[PDB]
Design a protein around this ligand. Structure first.
Ligand SMILES: Cc1cc2nc3c(=O)[nH]c(=O)nc-3n(C[C@H](O)[C@H](O)[C@H](O)COP(=O)(O)O)c2cc1C
Ligand code: SF4
Ligand code: SF4
Ligand code: SF4
Ligand code: SF4
Ligand code: SF4
Ligand code: FES
Ligand code: FES
Lengths: 32, 111, 105, 212, 98, 221, 147, 456
């Protein structure tokens, strides 16, 4: 009966990915 | 006699405990799944000319399915009349049920 | 003919109690072992040895008894397990290559 | 390199790296078990095979413990008696009263080792009752009665490691951990009916054999 | 050959030839007045070469004691009858033979 | 509560609905797989289930099937992981996941954790387990969340609102409710009632002096 | 008064199935402590070889010689292989009449007597049948009351 | 002769407990972190193990195993004659009710944990450190990884750790909601992509661990102090607390105290002194204290008559049949139901059992049901002895120590609050009309046609 949070479109992000997952794209094991 | 639940379902679930304990090998049982998938017997015979009337089946039954009635006045003209199949035993339970429940009611505390 | 054998362990249990002794058993004949009684559907027999078996501590004992009575006999030797050591730590071996199987405890 | 050890005061020799339960079988010592099978990977989850090992404070799982150069093993001490009785009590607390209707009856290792190694009476009388679990469809050959399950893991280990059919598993956690396929599907192995025999309990039984 | 004690039962194991001397001693010795044969019977052990175990149970009313004597026999190896020492033994041996 | 340990085939939950990770989400996965031995790719199942949950809303059997395909694990091995860990919502949830710690420390500490549930159960008018008809608040009790000195406390999506009072939790749900329209109205994370993180509410009894650094060290390097 | 009420009208709720609390406790009764079936006595078997050893070197309750550690372990096994080779008769014949007196010395000089089968007096013994102080027939009939 | 407790700020370790600085490296370098990391690396790995041995440092995750010995297991006979990687696994799981210290380290001063993995890794010759953070700690994982990226950017960790020629990687792995995954083998199996069911040991992680490789699992706190241990000295650490209980301890105080907080203090401190001069005392005064759980719910409860003169370390808390655990102090005033507070803990463990072994998967559910009945007095007093022996056949019979984690709290309540359990059984009998049967059924069950067996 109640509406939920499911991605209506295939390219929809239901939940914000998060601060921790942004520090992974920023991760780089080589010194600058 | 073979007994029912108050709903009328058979009490017997084909455990074969009475067939195994029987000191005289008087009981023969066959069983499969019923049409509704219930564990039930297809053959339940007691050879009354093999039975020693010891009550071991009634003691071994976990559901009170097989019992001995108080009846003793059933002498027959032919020996074939003493080969009870499932039909004969379920009819006996239907006729004698109020005695069967009363006897179980009185002695179950001691069983 | 009688069969002389060590009964195999049932596939349904781990207890080995009934594999300790040697069994002597009569082979079932082509005719007369069982038939359906027309009256009750019971299973009649003409084989007076059908429900008889003998137990022996050793097979030389079973063979000695069978030779003495004059039974024809056939000795079936028992299949024995092939030993292989087992280790719990083998569930967690390091795989240098493609995993080849994913274990689930 | 067969090492030499003592089990119940009698000496036995066996290859190094062998499990203690394998030495007990070689020595002729009977050790109760549910999870352990000679043809499967060691699990160590049932706790039935716990024995007393010298210089070891906790009782030890004889199926998982490696044999050493000089260990002394006591399988009939009070500690072993107490372990088997307690483990059998936990196995039977949630076990369903189904032996009249169960097809394992008369060939059941839970019944035989309860008679041999457990107590004669139970102490679980909870008003809250027992765990009950829904049944699973895993094809036409295997009838399931999952309340009887004791979580030995034998069917998962066989289906995965031996049969190469990784569709059987276990889902959930705790007392609610449940064996099955998470989504109802036929088990595609021509070796599937071996789980019926491997199952110590009548949780996985033969559908064509049912009740006969 | 040997004796065994289980709880309060003493069993004596003897070779068949000594059946008469041994039971004479158990009947007539002043410290063994087993003057009644309670029972004679047999047990079959096919795994044994002497398949038949013959078991005698005796009673000493004077000493309020019982003793068991075991010997062995075969299909073709007889045993001495103890009918000359005990009249009651007559039918028990016929039963063992039957 | 009533969490099933088997799959239930529903129009929102069956292998027929396809799940694909977005091209944005794939970049996350590529970095994730780098931090494990390549032949132990299956060690990334827990990270990848989390991303499928965040993209799709819940851990559907389709997310489970795509995670298995990416790591070449048999799907049952993924079903076992997803059903063993409680953070994977294998049933759809609402917009906000109210999670109130009711283990003993939060029961005792500060105001009753019984009162936080009492406040929550009257703010949304739904018992433990269910979601609001608007589909903004699924509410369930959870086990110790690691904020016991700040008891009682609650988690919603990734935040620990702590040091709670039945009025404070009440106004947090409103602030979260109004936040679906204006982002700036979202409540601040952390504990309420003035306390910063875990110090004494009646003044610091420690770390009052200036901290010491590298000025003191063993002379032998 | 007689069979009134009929046993079929005995109220079922009154009768209580009794349980003895050691055997029936829920707290302090481990099964293995009351498992008297598995603690059954094995039969104690003595062959001719064992009695010769028991005569040569005595018993654990009463040894014949010191048998202290080394040179006694080999001495003890000598008494075993001798018992196996020569039976009781040959052993006694070599040792002579003194050994025969030693066998009876085990039983206190006289040969032993068979054990009794009643323990009413506290020891195994014969039952001491004696005439009852009250003769039911008196003396008018040929039957006597033994107590 | 000397009283332990009340160490000064200059002698603390976690100088950022109360969030006075941002978690950036600028402030971390100001605090001595990452100061002489190069020189410590160039020193032999025996030197680091000796320093951790000398300090008397014991594992801070609950077990109290001396860290220096523990980390030495990894440097077996021929560790250098193999090509397998070698793993440091930081246990940042924190599911034990009461403890909050581990979250503070990860969010207040991340660079102590990062510089610990580096230091602790070289002591046991590890190629990579894996930090397993509980999945509900989403924010703390973000702050920890930000520090990790910044440590990666400075050359501080990675291919050439601080220019010492030591390859080392530090990674973050998040959990997904399981208290069992704080167990050492459960953590290892969770890291490999499996449900967190503990492994049996003999296979010892030092030999066979993560991915089948040599691995050591260490609590967050016991890692975060190793660098400042070396920078200040083992002798300096082996000066606080009694002879075998050395150093400083992070105490998380919660429950019925006026100001629950998280403070660093000294091993072997009087328990009363810790609560009174760091948390405002007990609600209603020290005379109002009913009982406390000293080291987290897995430790047995301690009553007032022992809490009066109790020292906070391993040996003393063991002497009073309790344990230091994770130093998670949960205190109850006189206005509590102590049985209900422990029934909740039994319900915690019934939800956290992995379900692999028989005594725990079935025993945790069984003890939980009895605990619910003991809340309402719905049983006979002989069942109290029955519950005590149920805990005993759980104890020492399980694959992992979660089995003791739920057996001990019940034993502590039976040991110290049996009259309270007896009392409500009396109350419930005074209402129903008689003592209840075993299992919670009323005295009159047989009268009402219920199924009742003899001996119940
Ligand atoms: C059920 C259970 C849960 C545990 N949870 C944790 C935990 O959350 N954190 C932790 O550091 N240790 C935990 N431990 C203890 C670990 O197994 C291990 O002792 C510790 O993580 C590392 O040892 P150390 O304290 O010497 O560093 C737990 C143990 C058990 C049995
Ligand atoms: S009568 Fe009773 S004992 Fe016999 S098969 Fe039916 S249920 Fe089993
Ligand atoms: S009463 Fe008759 S049928 Fe029943 S067990 Fe006895 S002999 Fe068998
Ligand atoms: S599995 Fe064994 S114990 Fe359980 S119901 Fe079937 S036969 Fe009885
Ligand atoms: S279903 Fe049977 S084989 Fe599978 S885990 Fe349960 S008891 Fe073991
Ligand atoms: S004790 Fe509990 S958590 Fe540990 S292995 Fe056994 S069932 Fe799993
Ligand atoms: S057989 Fe060893 S634990 Fe199951
Ligand atoms: S008990 Fe609620 S946060 Fe730890």
């Amino acid at each position: 009966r109640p509406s939920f949070a499911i991605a209506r479109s295939p390219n929809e992000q239901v939940f914000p990915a998060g601060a921790f997952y942004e520090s992974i794209l920023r991760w780089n094991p080589n010194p600058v | 006699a073979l007994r029912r639940y108050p709903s009328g379902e058979e009490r017997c679930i084909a455990c074969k405990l009475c067939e195994a304990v029987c000191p005289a090998q008087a009981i023969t049982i066959e069983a499969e799944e019923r049409a509704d998938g219930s564990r039930r017997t297809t053959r339940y015979d007691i050879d009354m000319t093999k039975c020693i009337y010891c009550g071991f089946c009634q003691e071994s039954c976990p559901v009170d399915a097989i019992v001995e009635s108080p009846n003793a006045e059933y002498a027959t003209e032919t020996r074939e009349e003493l080969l009870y199949n499932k039909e004969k035993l379920l009819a006996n339970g239907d006729k004698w049920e109020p005695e069967l429940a009363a006897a179980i009611r009185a002695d179950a505390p001691y069983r | 003919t009688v069969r002389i054998y060590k009964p195999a362990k049932p596939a349904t249990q781990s207890g080995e109690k009934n594999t300790q002794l040697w069994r002597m058993d009569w082979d079932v004949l082509g005719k007369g072992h069982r038939w359906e009684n027309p009256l009750m559907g019971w299973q009649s027999s003409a084989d007076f040895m059908q429900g008889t078996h003998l137990t022996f501590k050793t097979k030389e004992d079973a063979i000695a008894f069978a030779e003495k009575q004059g039974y024809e006999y056939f000795v079936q030797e028992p299949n024995e397990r092939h030993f292989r050591p087992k280790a719990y730590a083998n569930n967690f071996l390091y795989s240098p290559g493609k995993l080849k199987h994913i274990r689930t405890k | 390199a067969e090492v030499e050890l003592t089990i119940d005061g009698k000496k036995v020799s066996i290859e190094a790296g062998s499990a203690l339960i394998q030495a007990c079988e070689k020595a002729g010592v009977v050790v109760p078990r549910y999870c352990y099978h000679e043809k499967l990977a060691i699990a160590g989850n049932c706790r039935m095979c716990l024995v007393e090992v010298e210089r070891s404070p906790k009782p030890v799982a004889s199926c998982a413990w490696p044999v050493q150069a000089g260990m002394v093993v006591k399988t009939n001490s009070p500690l072993t008696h107490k372990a088997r009785e307690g483990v059998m009590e936990f196995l039977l607390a949630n076990h369903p009263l189904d032996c009249p209707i169960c097809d394992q009856g008369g060939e059941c290792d839970l019944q035989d080792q309860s008679m041999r190694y457990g107590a004669d009476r139970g102490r679980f009388h909870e008003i809250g009752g027992k765990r009950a679990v829904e049944d699973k469809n895993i094809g036409p050959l295997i009838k399931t009665s999952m309340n009887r399950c004791i979580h030995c893991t034998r069917c998962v280990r066989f289906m995965n490691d031996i049969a190469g059919a990784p569709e059987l598993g276990s889902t959930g956690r705790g007392n609610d951990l449940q064996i099955g396929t998470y989504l109802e599907k036929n088990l595609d192995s021509e070796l599937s009916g071996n789980v019926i025999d491997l199952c110590p309990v009548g949780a996985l039984t033969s559908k064509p054999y049912a009740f006969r | 050959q040997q004796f065994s004690v289980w709880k309060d039962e003493l069993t004596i194991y003897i070779c068949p030839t000594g059946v008469i001397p041994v039971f004479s001693f158990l009947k007539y010795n002043t410290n063994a007045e087993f003057t009644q044969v309670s029972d004679i019977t047999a047990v079959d052990f096919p795994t044994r070469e002497m398949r038949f175990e013959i078991v005698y149970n005796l009673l000493s009313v004077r000493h309020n004691a019982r003793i068991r004597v075991k010997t062995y026999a075969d299909e073709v190896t007889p045993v001495p009858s103890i009918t000359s020492l005990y009249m009651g033994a007559n039918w028990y041996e016929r039963e063992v033979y039957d | 509560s009533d969490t099933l340990m088997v799959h239930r085939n529903t129009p929102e939950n069956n292998p027929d609905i396809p799940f694909k990770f977005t091209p944005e989400n794939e970049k996350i996965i590529e970095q994730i797989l780098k931090r494990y031995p390549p032949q132990y790719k299956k060690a990334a199942v827990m990270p990848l289930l989390d991303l499928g949950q965040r993209q799709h809303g819940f851990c559907s059997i389709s997310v489970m099937n795509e995670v298995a395909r990416i790591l070449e694990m048999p799907p049952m091995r993924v079903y076992e992981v997803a059903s063993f860990y409680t953070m994977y919502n294998r049933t759809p949830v609402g917009k906000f996941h109210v999670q109130a710690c009711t283990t003993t420390p939060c029961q005792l500490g500060g105001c009753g954790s019984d009162a936080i549930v009492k406040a929550i159960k009257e703010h949304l008018g739904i018992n433990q387990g269910e979601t609001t008809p608007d589909g903004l608040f699924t509410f369930i009790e959870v086990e110790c969340l690691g904020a016991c000195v700040n008891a009682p406390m609650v988690q919603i999506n990734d935040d620990y609102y702590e040091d709670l009072t039945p009025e404070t939790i009440k106004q947090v749900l409103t602030a979260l409710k109004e936040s679906v329209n204006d982002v700036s109205k979202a409540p601040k994370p952390g504990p309420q009632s003035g306390r910063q993180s875990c110090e004494n509410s009646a003044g610091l009894t420690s770390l009052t002096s200036e901290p010491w650094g590298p000025e003191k060290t063993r002379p032998d390097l | 008064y007689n069979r009134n009420p009929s046993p079929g009208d005995n109220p079922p709720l009154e009768y209580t199935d009794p349980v003895t609390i050691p055997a029936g406790d829920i707290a302090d009764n481990p099964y293995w402590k009351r498992d008297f079936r598995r603690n059954y006595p094995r039969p104690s078997v003595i062959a001719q070889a064992q009695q010769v050893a028991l005569l040569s070197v005595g018993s654990a309750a009463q040894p014949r010689v010191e048998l202290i550690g080394e040179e006694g372990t080999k001495a003890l096994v000598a008494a075993e292989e001798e018992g196996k080779e020569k039976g009781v008769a040959k052993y006694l014949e070599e040792k002579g009449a003194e050994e025969a007196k030693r066998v009876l010395a085990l039983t206190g000089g006289l040969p032993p007597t068979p054990s009794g089968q009643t323990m009413v007096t506290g020891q195994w013994d014969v039952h001491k049948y004696g005439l009852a102080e009250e003769q039911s027939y008196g003396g008018s009939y040929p039957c006597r009351s033994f107590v | 002769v000397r009283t332990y407790g009340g160490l000064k700020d200059q002698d603390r370790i976690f100088q950022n407990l109360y969030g006075r600085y941002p978690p950036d490296l600028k402030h971390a370098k100001k605090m001595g972190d990452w100061y002489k990391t190069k020189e410590i690396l160039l020193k032999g790995h025996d030197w680091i193990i000796g320093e951790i041995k000398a300090s008397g440092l014991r594992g801070r995750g609950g077990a109290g195993f001396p860290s220096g010995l523990k980390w030495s297991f990894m440097n077996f006979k021929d560790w250098d004659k193999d090509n397998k990687p070698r793993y440091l696994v930081v246990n940042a799981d924190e599911g034990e009710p009461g403890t909050c210290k581990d979250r503070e380290i990860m969010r207040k001063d991340p660079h102590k944990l990062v510089e610990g993995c580096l230091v602790a890794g070289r002591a046991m010759n590890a190629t990579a450190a894996y930090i397993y953070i509980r999945g509900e700690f989403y924010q703390e994982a973000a702050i920890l990884q930000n520090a990790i990226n910044e440590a990666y950017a400075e050359g501080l960790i990675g291919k050439n750790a601080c220019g010492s020629g030591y390859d080392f990687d530090v990674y973050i792995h998040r959990g997904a909601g399981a208290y069992v995954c704080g167990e050492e083998t459960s953590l290892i199996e969770s890291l490999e992509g499996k449900p967190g069911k503990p492994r049996l040991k003999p296979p010892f992680p030092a030999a066979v661990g993560l991915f089948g490789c040599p691995s050591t699992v260490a609590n967050v706190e016991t890692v975060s102090v190793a660098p400042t241990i070396c920078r200040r000295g083992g002798a300096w650490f082996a000066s606080f607390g009694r002879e075998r209980n050395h150093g400083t301890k992070l105490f998380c105080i919660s429950g019925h105290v006026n100001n629950p907080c998280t403070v660093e203090e000294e091993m072997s401190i009087p328990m009363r002194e810790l609560i009174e001069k760091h948390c405002g005392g007990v609600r209603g005064g020290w005379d109002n204290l009913l009982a406390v759980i000293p080291g987290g719910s897995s430790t047995p409860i301690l009553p007032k008559h022992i809490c009066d003169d109790q020292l906070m370390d391993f040996d003393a808390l063991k002497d009073s049949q309790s344990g230091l655990g994770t130093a998670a102090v949960i205190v109850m005033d006189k206005s509590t139901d102590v049985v209900r507070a422990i029934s909740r803990l039994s319900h915690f463990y019934r939800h956290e059992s992995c379900g692999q072994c028989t005594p725990c998967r079935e025993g945790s559910k069984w003890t939980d049901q009895i605990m619910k009945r003991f809340e309402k007095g719905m049983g006979r007093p002989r069942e109290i002895d029955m519950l005590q022996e149920l805990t005993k056949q759980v104890e020492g019979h399980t694959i992992c120590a979660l089995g003791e984690a739920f057996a001990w709290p019940i034993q502590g309540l039976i040991r110290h609050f049996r009259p309270e359990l007896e009392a409500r059984m009396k109350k419930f009998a005074e209402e129903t009309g008689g003592q209840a049967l075993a299992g919670g059924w009323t005295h009159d069950s047989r009268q009402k046609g219920r199924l009742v067996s003899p001996g119940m």
